[PDB]
Write a protein that holds these residues in place. Sequence first.
Motif: not given
Ligand SMILES: [Zn+2]
Length: 429
Positions: A129-131, A140-143, A151-153
């Motif tokens: 997920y994107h935190p 704003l987490c992964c751009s 999801g990046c996290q």
């Molecule tokens: Zn992300």
Amino acid sequence: MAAVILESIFLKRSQQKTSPLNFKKRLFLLTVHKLSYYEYDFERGRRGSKKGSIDVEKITCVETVIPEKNPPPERQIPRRGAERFPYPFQVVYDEGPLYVFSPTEELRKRWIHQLKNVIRYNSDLVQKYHPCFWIDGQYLCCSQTAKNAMGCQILENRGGGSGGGEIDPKDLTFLKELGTGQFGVVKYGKWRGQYDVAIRMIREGSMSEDEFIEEAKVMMNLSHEKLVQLYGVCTKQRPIFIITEYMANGCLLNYLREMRHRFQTQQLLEMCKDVCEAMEYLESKQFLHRDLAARNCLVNDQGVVKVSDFGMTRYVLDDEYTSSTGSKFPVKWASPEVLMYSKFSSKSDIWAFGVLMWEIYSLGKMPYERFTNSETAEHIAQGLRLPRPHLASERVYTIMYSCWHEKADERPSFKILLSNILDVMDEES
Ligand SMILES: [Zn+2]
Ligand SMILES: C[C@H]1CN(C2COC2)CCN1c1ccc(Nc2cc(-c3ccnc(N4CCn5c(cc6c5CC(C)(C)C6)C4=O)c3CO)cn(C)c2=O)nc1
């Protein structure tokens, strides 16, 4: 007449690239079917018209969101312990993420919990997920520049929800019996009369409950299309329940023994592929089955085989099944090193898988039918091996036979077995 699970007033943020962000107060309704938000007549204290809804079955994750770096006065944590909404949480689904701000931290914790209770049975639950928020057409987490970006996290729990696996039995309905196993009766039911589930009622004294409850935290996060899913547990009663995915067609061993099916060899190989795929996934997670056999596999309404009761052997309190010489011990599926030294590993599961393939291509025939459990243990250590089933070609027999080498290090891995099965499927078909 669907039951309303929760009722609260939140601050809903508009869903956009160059459009302006707008925040409005809305009354959110949560049911087992949908999550809807309405306009609210505050002066009259009355719910207004509906402005939108989200399909429950389409939600993939619910979790908090890192607050804004410089939020406006309406969404700032108060300096002194329905005006402020400084605590956000997100509901992820196909139509981008929905961001909802809560006035209190406790209220946010209640909705993320109940929301998870409502989506834990979804088949599209995600593990990432994107935190952070999605702003300026970017995360704003992964751009990433796509709301549907991966999801990046890593999520602490599958599908979010931040025990978290405590299903309340008041929403369960028993509808049909499914038989009895090592831990007692198993029944078919529904959660809130919607999601089909299987309820495993654990007989007291048959399971190391405390040890399993600690492992259920990890088993819940394990998910694979060919793996029977664990939804949760009910541990505030006697006996405790284990809620898992429901398989309509039932045990694989019985399924293979119904001669009316009249399986084709292509169908039998598909069964081996389904199991191998699940084991390869468990193999990648350092998870062992320890009791792989046709009796421990299940079949769904579409004829898909799925591995079940993986890792459950470590909690059986029956010594007649744990002891290597017990009447319930699966001697005919154990490798020589297991019967002689109790050396368990991924290769011992490979041995059992080879026997599983032999069962599938023999249509549920007992292995070493002419030998007893004691006779088998003495003979397999000498070189006794199962013969080639009539429905199994020489190439298919070569796969299951490779799983029965003397030296465990010489046996293939589930990743190699899957490649061998996929190869035969591409040639012998
Ligand atoms: Zn992300
Ligand atoms: C097909 C129809 C036919 N019907 C006829 C038609 O009119 C009557 C009868 C019902 N039948 C049916 C339907 C559906 C199902 N589905 C499910 C069965 C089971 C189930 C039931 C009983 N014992 C077991 N076992 C057996 C394995 N095992 C257990 C615990 C342990 C093991 C191994 C161990 C020793 C490591 C520990 C254990 O619990 C299981 C498997 O978990 C579990 N899950 C999730 C299901 O979805 N089963 C049967």
